[model samples]
Target: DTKEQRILRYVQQNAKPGDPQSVLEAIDTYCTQKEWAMNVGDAKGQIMDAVIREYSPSLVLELGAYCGYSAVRMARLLQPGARLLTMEINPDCAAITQQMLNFAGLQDKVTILNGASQDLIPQLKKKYDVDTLDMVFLDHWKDRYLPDTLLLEKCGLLRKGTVLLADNVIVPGTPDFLAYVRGSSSFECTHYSSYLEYMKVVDGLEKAIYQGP
Candidate 1:
């Protein structure tokens, strides 16, 4: 079994079944004490929660739905009547995340779209019936971050005041995405200093507020 399978195993054995909070706690504890997993850990999750809570987004997009951990985190903070769509490129990961989301009681909070973002993005307009996004969580591959943002821009999906948070910016570092978001007239971006998901030796997250014209 994979690392995710191991985490699920731990959660099943330890967490109170049907309880999202307990399930998440078990996953966090497993990742921290047992195996070093990359589910945004705790340090950064606080910051992500702050942003999501403040926004109270009506329509949100998540670039990566790794193990559904971040999806559970973000979805719990969304306002009532709000919706979040999460994208996952890998079939296996997508399948596992769906189950994870279901177990966490977040099955209704996010729609897990399986496929490369570039391909699925265009369909979002109709799929979600929204012309622009209120927020986006960028936690996908470091290299695809910049391109995907540009695609969102090209597709005219993100509007003025849209909130965008990109994780693992320092762990793997998305310099180009960082630069574009900071310099572009379309976004008022900032790098908030924070430790990596599970590793403290590394740092930071890029928080971008769209300034689209």
Candidate 2:
């Protein structure tokens, strides 16, 4: 079975029903002790949690829905009626994410979009009725980071103060994406240095605020 499958089994058997924290701890314990499947782990997740809390976003978008770990983390803190829309390119991963959200009882708070980010981003306005996203978490393919940001701007999804938090900005670096955001006057960028998930390797999260075009 895949690592994600193992995590699903573990979470099902160990985590409490409707408990997002327990679900996260189950995945964190398993990944830290047994195998490492990237779900932003617990360390970086704290920073994400802080961002979410600070923004108190009404509409959030996550570019990657890997295992739904981050989704659960974010959904648990969201205000009532707020929603998270996450996109995943892999069907298998999307399916696992769906189950994870359901297990956390976050199905009502989050939606898993199974398709390429490039494809689904354009449809957000018409299909999801999202005029402007409050925050966007980019943890998807590093290569798509730059293009997707441009696409979000083109689609008019980003507004002033939209927070864009990106993971793995150091280890598997995204030089171009980093440069674009840091260089662009339209974004105010900040970097939080931290170790990679479950390891000593250097990694960081980039928090950029959209200043508008």
lDDT of each: 0.82, 0.90
Looking at model 2, the pairs that clash are none
lDDT of 2 at 136: 95
Candidate 2: TM-score?
0.97
Q: Please, what are the lDDT tens digits per residue for candidate 1 over residues 131-184? A: 899988888888999999888988999888998899878777788998888888
Per-candidate TM-score against the hidden true structure: 0.94, 0.97
Error of 1 at 125 (Å): 1.2
Model 2, position 10: C-alpha lDDT score:
90
| Strongest candidate by lDDT | 2
The TM-score obtained by model 1 is 0.94
